[PDB]
Amino acid sequence: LALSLTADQMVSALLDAEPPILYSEYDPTRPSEASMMGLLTNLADRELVHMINWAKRVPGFVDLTLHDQVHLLECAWLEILMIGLVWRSMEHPGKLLFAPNLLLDRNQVEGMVEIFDMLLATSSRFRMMNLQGEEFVCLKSIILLNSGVYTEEKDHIHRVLDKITDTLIHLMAKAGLTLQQQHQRLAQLLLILSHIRHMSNKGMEHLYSMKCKNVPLSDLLLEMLDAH
Amino acid sequence: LALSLTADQMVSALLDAEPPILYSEYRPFSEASMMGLLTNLADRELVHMINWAKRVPGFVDLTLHDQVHLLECAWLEILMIGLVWRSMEHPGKLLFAPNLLLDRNQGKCVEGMVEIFDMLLATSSRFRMMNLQGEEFVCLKSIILLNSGVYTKDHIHRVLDKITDTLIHLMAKAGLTLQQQHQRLAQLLLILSHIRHMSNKGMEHLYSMKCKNVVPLSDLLLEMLDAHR
Amino acid sequence: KILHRLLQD
Amino acid sequence: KILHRLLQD
Numbered sequence: 001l002a003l004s005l006t007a008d009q010m011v012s013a014l015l016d017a018e019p020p021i022l023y024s025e026y027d028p029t030r031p032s033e034a035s036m037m038g039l040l041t042n043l044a045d046r047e048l049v050h051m052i053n054w055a056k057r058v059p060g061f062v063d064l065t066l067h068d069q070v071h072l073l074e075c076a077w078l079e080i081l082m083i084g085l086v087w088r089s090m091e092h093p094g095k096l097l098f099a100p101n102l103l104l105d106r107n108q109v110e111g112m113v114e115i116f117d118m119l120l121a122t123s124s125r126f127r128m129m130n131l132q133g134e135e136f137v138c139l140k141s142i143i144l145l146n147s148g149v150y151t152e153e154k155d156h157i158h159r160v161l162d163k164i165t166d167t168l169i170h171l172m173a174k175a176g177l178t179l180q181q182q183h184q185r186l187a188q189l190l191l192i193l194s195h196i197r198h199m200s201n202k203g204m205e206h207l208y209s210m211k212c213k214n215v216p217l218s219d220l221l222l223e224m225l226d227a228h
Numbered sequence: 229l230a231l232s233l234t235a236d237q238m239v240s241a242l243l244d245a246e247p248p249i250l251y252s253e254y255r256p257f258s259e260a261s262m263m264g265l266l267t268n269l270a271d272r273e274l275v276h277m278i279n280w281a282k283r284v285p286g287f288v289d290l291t292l293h294d295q296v297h298l299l300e301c302a303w304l305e306i307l308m309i310g311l312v313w314r315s316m317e318h319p320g321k322l323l324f325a326p327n328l329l330l331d332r333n334q335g336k337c338v339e340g341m342v343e344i345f346d347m348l349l350a351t352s353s354r355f356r357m358m359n360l361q362g363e364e365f366v367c368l369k370s371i372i373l374l375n376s377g378v379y380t381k382d383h384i385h386r387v388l389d390k391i392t393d394t395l396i397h398l399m400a401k402a403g404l405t406l407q408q409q410h411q412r413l414a415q416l417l418l419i420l421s422h423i424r425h426m427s428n429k430g431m432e433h434l435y436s437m438k439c440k441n442v443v444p445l446s447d448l449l450l451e452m453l454d455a456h457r
Numbered sequence: 458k459i460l461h462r463l464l465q466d
Numbered sequence: 467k468i469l470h471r472l473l474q475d
Binding site for chain 1: 347350351354371375376379380385388389392393395396406407409410411413414415417418419420421422423424425428429432457
């Protein structure tokens, strides 16, 4: 059914499937590494529930087996969280909007500083390219379908991926971009996904080390972590 | 001077800059022996990679600092995509060297190497499925060199756009329609995300093999490794 | 397995 | 760095 939708219909379905922007348990009436880590992991855990139900609404995802759905989410969950965070932070230069009540400088854990600058640089890149919401939801769906696709069934996924590629080009054509500009912008967007993968890998390593340190992760967040 | 070339001139310059295929220093493999072979091969390939990088259009225009950053960031990705490309005509096998062709079973000689082997094999079969051309390969490899560390910039992005134009040009000549062209461009660039993933997995394994002192690593290979902390 | 179950419900 | 030397030569 995902193959039948038009480009505009693809966009609409993706926009309508968008998860909510959740709030943190952050209280500004108190200034630490352990507590900050707690806020972020707690937020990520509650977001994971919405992401799972968002994935079901991504065209073509329900056509996959339960095992394959589990695999794709296990592989791309941190990538999806990160591109969402980066998208939220576009209007806030030098800042990361984890939640509407949680907006952080790079000033505000160990090793987290590196990931922060990478997330900031990613947000700055999107701001420079003036990334559109219609393009964002396309990229996020691509991450879900592509990140674990190489780790019949793969033929359907690539077909949906091609459809999302069709959609991105259609959006850029409407924006007035020439054919050359469309290919270039398409490339620029997909190359960023390589950096998002990199940030996720680095984030996954730090998440495991924080786990072994036992400084506060949920059961779901741990199961997602053990899968990597 | 890179932005001035035609797409055909870009292809020719990249093909001409191609590093040689090196041989292993060639008995059934142990853990330490295979690791010795692979890291020794990697070390010798790094010297050729550096000189290959200089011959990538627009790379010399960058400062020495930026050249170092890009290479430190992407060197394993570049080794891997080269390996994957060499193994295309050898399904189920990895051609590290013409005298060093390994399969999945031999990957069990080293713990944790089995997972990386599969990902590399999967990437090679993917290129084989898409019928990746050599002209497309040299474009993708140069993209990795310029992109991987660019977000850790205007000229690089301009050269990246130039290579994008070069890719589409190659596809337009192959007889692909406009729709086919965008789609294949997307398919190729999405694989770069998996190559990044394999590199990070490979980098972590190399760091652990370093810690365990299984086999002494070269000073160069260690400095490329330390750059990723 | 939580992810397994949440994907069902 | 060795990378410095190899890049300059």
